[PDB]
Amino acid sequence: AELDADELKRVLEALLLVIDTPVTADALAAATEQPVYRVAAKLQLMADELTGRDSGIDLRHTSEGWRMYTRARFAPYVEKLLLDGARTKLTRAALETLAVVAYRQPVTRARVSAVRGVNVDAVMRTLLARGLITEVGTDADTGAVTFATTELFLERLGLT
Template sequence: MPDTFAPALEALLMLATEPVSAADLAEAVGEPEAAVDAALAELAAFYDSTGRGFELRHVGGGWRYYTREEHAELISTWLLEGQRGSLSQAALETLAVVAYLQPISRGRVSAVRGVNVDGVMRTLATRDLIEEVGRDPETGARLFATTGYFLERMGLSSLDELPPLAPHLPEASALEAELADLAAAAVPESQAVPLVEADDE
């Protein structure tokens, strides 16, 4: 097996949603970049020699895990079958956050929900309920929004028809306050608007 810090590299790469450079990984584990590069190459060779269902590739200037090509049909079938299933409570809550705060980064969604949402966001994107719509001009983070298919599934003609948050989310008052705080922080106070307008009745 590779160096003693290889498990730390594996743990970091498990969380990666895009290739991570050896320099960034070296900084994270506190090891020389050359040693990290060598460990990554050794890990990749180890996965190949032991016939794992995934591989470690060096692409786009960084390293990332990928499933092997020979399993593509199996994975495609599994994902398509998953699209016909119902969404979990975690997925529904994540989708609600995206719908009401879009465009929004994955990090901000995680901040609102208080948990890592990478896997849930991938599920929602796979089901064509959300999509990447650009990058935050300040942080460079990817921004996500709901899709036309989301509106179709919800029976809406536009996002303006979304109902108020409170009746539909668990602990809605706390979540709505959190959403409002985040939205206000994203724009100057003079331009901030309430997420849910008061009922005219």
């Protein structure tokens, strides 16, 4: 069994993909049945090519061995992508109560709770934390804080 330059590169790509921690040239060498000097060289050539095209992937060598990393300049994109998981979509109940605030704008939660026919603290909270609505003032007659949809609401929704 023997792998030419192009084959060795392939196998190494497959392997560098499945690892969750750096691997050693020796581990790869053994796994692939090749001389380590050959693997060591190949990894540095594959790393050279990737940074040669400024790939999103950066193959770097550390005391723990070799591993594919995210190229520096792309951190910002990595950050956002993951964070766009922290908060799941809005439930229909939530949109429902969002609409109530939207269409009745200055509204106390007491009227939102009544109009929805249920307690709305959980949904109010999330709507608040997500900046879709906010405290505007208070009701003169009752002294209960009033609410309104933010500007961001007009955005995530459409237009302004």
